[PDB]
Amino acid sequence: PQITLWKRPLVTIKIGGQLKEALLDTGADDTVIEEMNLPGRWKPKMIGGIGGFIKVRQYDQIIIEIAGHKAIGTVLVGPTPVNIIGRNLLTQIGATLNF
Amino acid sequence: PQITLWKRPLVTIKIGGQLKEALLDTGADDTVIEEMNLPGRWKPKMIGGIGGFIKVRQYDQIIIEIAGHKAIGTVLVGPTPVNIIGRNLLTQIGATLNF
Ligand SMILES: Cc1ccc(S(=O)(=O)NC(=O)NC2CCN(c3nccc(C(F)(F)F)n3)CC2)cc1
Ligand SMILES: Cc1ccc(S(=O)(=O)NC(=O)NC2CCN(c3nccc(C(F)(F)F)n3)CC2)cc1
Ligand SMILES: [Mg+2]
Q1: Taking the domain B1-99, which CATH number applies?
Q2: CB of A23 within 8 A of CB of A8?
Q3: How close A24 gets to chain B, by Cα (Å)?
Q4: Do B27 and A29 touch (CB under 8 A)?
């Protein structure tokens, strides 16, 4: 698709069997999805913000479908108020910014 | 331009006479630029993050040139570690996400 930006660029994703909504985020390095169970090993990781740090679980090579497009990458899972598709996955679905 | 996303989508901007680098950020509502003097009135505003809140100064109807493209909008100025062009300005330069 071609998505204008007058509202939050929210799309439907499919990850680990489930349907969720996620924000297409050119400002994020990494993809972060609210709490859920995913197959495979993971490793804890700390994400930094203005007041401090939040612990999440890094899973590698996860399959996710993003508005129809399949991709594979690292997904961080933890207590985020928004599901974010970061550049690690936007690159895998071929997304660009155009103006 | 058409910008791929393998690295941070950083562009040169021109605001208030000065050249700066800023991140094209589809995940931000608002544009936020590090400390500088701008003409006109402003009003304080609080931005929220994980550990708490950061005070910035909202200026309306500021001219900014973003990788060649002129736009006019609200710019928040304060102590941000990165210059962010949010959707309020990406909409004004006609930017879209495509995949
Ligand atoms: C103005 C401005 C924009 C962006 C940045 S940044 O340093 O480029 N980004 C950034 O700092 N984002 C943090 C915001 C809070 N966020 C978060 N909030 C709640 C929960 C979770 C977690 F860990 F579960 F995923 N994460 C973490 C990233 C700086 C200044
Ligand atoms: C995982 C995740 C991503 C994004 C969000 S969010 O709630 O969509 N975004 C967000 O929370 N961003 C905050 C990150 C820190 N940022 C900031 N950092 C330093 C300085 C300044 C200031 F005020 F000067 F501009 N701002 C504020 C925005 C949540 C979870
Ligand atoms: Mg962000």
Answers
A1: 2.40.70.10
A2: yes
A3: 7
A4: no
